[PDB]
Design a protein around this ligand. Sequence first.
Ligand SMILES: [N+]
Length: 153
Amino acid sequence: KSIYEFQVNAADGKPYDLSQHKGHPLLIYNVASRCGYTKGGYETATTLYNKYKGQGFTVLAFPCNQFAGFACTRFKADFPIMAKIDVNGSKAHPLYEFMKATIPGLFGTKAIKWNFTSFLIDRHGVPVERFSPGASVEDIEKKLLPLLGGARI
Ligand SMILES: [N+]
């Protein structure tokens, strides 16, 4: 079981080539589609994407208007933004049900609670880590640096 058994549209609204990232770690974030504290999670995402993309790594942002409790200037980033999805409820994306079921917020139901929650994916496409929006760059590197070689050899 891996993320590569799910299909997803990209921002342009057409099917995204998810499998191009197979055999390399990847971080997947939920981000607000509208306004989005561009400090914190956003700067960790961008930092990691720039420090590590060169070696196969990417960050994927799934816009989601589920935690705004029609605003600002629409999410922008250097990494791949996907088509807006729901991450919780009867219409959540099975990709998100898969990752949330694989790694829950202990209780919290497993539900996504915050924007800029991320999941780290291994070379095989298995979610191995769930980070909170306030996780630092270093805190993500502790788990990620032993994946930029796969976890082997
Ligand atoms: N998507």
